Amino acid sequence: RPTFYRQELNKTIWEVPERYQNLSPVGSGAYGSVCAAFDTKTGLRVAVKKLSRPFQSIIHAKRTYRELRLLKHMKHENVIGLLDVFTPARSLEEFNDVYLVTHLMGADLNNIVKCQKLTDDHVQFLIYQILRGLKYIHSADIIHRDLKPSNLAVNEDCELKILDFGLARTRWYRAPEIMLNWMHYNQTVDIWSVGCIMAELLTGRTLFPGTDHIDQLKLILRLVGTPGAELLKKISSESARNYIQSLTKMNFANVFIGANPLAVDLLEKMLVLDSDKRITAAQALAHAYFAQYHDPDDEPVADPFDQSFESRDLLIDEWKSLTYDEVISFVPPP
Ligand SMILES: CCCCCCCCO[C@@H]1O[C@H](CO)[C@@H](O)[C@H](O)[C@H]1O
Ligand SMILES: CCCCCCCCO[C@@H]1O[C@H](CO)[C@@H](O)[C@H](O)[C@H]1O
């Protein structure tokens, strides 16, 4: 066991191993708060997240377990992974707090085109990394569901990692089927998000900046066009088909004037209403737009992820015990 020290942060006592220094609050959420810190043991800037009352209820407890399981699973250059997880508790009986440590890359894509659009060469590099990481996540049978610029961290060398779990420092990037509570989501919900992000990097402007939910959907329909006959067959409701026909084309092509035609071709393949017809991450990696970076020998897939817990309805004490097990078994990365 490491030596811990105590300090008041974000309105509670944080108790952390001595290696983590210079904690500074950077965020809080309903479920946790984050400090930036410096890990004197590895020389890395890190984010330390202290969960807030991780076992307050069955739902909190399951969320805590899910977050830790997902972070422990992720071992890929373009996906955030778990550098450390700890608790000052010395037994399951004392176990009440959980702290998660991840890389702090130092910036994200959220600010990035406020001032000007990116070059085509730089968009190739960033989107390539997003898709390389998404191929990995998808191969584990995991769907991100909330890809957006603030969930894409980059360092000074513009190496990129996909984030989640409130490490991000809007519905503009959400697949329309998620907004329409469709359920039965495909992984290509995330490909829609990548298309929205890529479009914005190339043009310097949000692709679908809706003011509210229905506005978001109206903007999408204006740009990609009304559902064709094949997609209309997959929508049960006659009234819904009538209603979309009433809101429903602005040129997709006119949005991307001056762009690399290979970029536009890829955007057209990502931003397809019918999720069954969107390009996959793996397919996208092979598209000619990425010829400078694609290497099939180094676009690795994930170990399969045991998601049995997702469908379980367990008691708090069981979720808490399962979480404690995962804390104790953690082995830090190379
Ligand atoms: C702006 C457009 C307004 C209406 C959007 C269409 C609503 C589609 O609705 C969805 O259709 C699916 C297929 O039948 C169902 O399985 C889903 O339960 C349902 O949510
Ligand atoms: C903008 C208003 C219309 C939105 C239509 C969105 C259609 C998304 O696509 C749908 O996704 C479902 C879930 O994966 C699939 O089961 C369907 O087969 C697929 O067509």
Side-chain angles (χ1 to χ4, degrees), residues 175-180 182-189 192 216-222 224-227 230-235 244 247 272-278:
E177 62 267 33
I178 291 186
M179 302 198 289
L180 292 165
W182 209 284
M183 298 312 186
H184 303 89
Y185 304 119
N186 247 35
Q187 308 181 322
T188 47
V189 295
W192 182 272
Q216 185 70 29
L217 295 171
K218 285 164 50 180
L219 296 180
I220 288 172
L221 288 165
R222 278 233 256 168
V224 305
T226 95
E230 184 178 38
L231 176 56
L232 254 5
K233 294 167 109 294
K234 304 168 178 192
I235 300 170
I244 103 188
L247 307 173
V272 180
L273 284 190
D274 187 347
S275 75
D276 301 318
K277 297 223 151 302
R278 296 177 196 147

Side-chain angles (χ1 to χ4, degrees), residues 51 53-70 92 95-98 305-328:
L51 303 197
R53 294 181 293 269
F55 309 111
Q56 176 177 317
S57 67
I58 290 165
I59 301 169
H60 282 84
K62 185 172 179 175
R63 182 180 266 92
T64 292
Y65 181 72
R66 175 167 51 238
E67 181 169 338
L68 177 57
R69 284 288 311 288
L70 284 170
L92 173 61
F95 179 50
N96 245 292
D97 283 313
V98 171
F305 177 65
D306 166 18
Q307 270 185 114
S308 65
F309 72 92
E310 284 288 2
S311 55
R312 302 306 204 261
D313 284 326
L314 306 181
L315 302 180
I316 281 166
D317 283 351
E318 183 156 15
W319 287 124
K320 182 174 166 181
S321 188
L322 289 169
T323 301
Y324 191 68
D325 292 333
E326 290 291 329
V327 175
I328 290 319

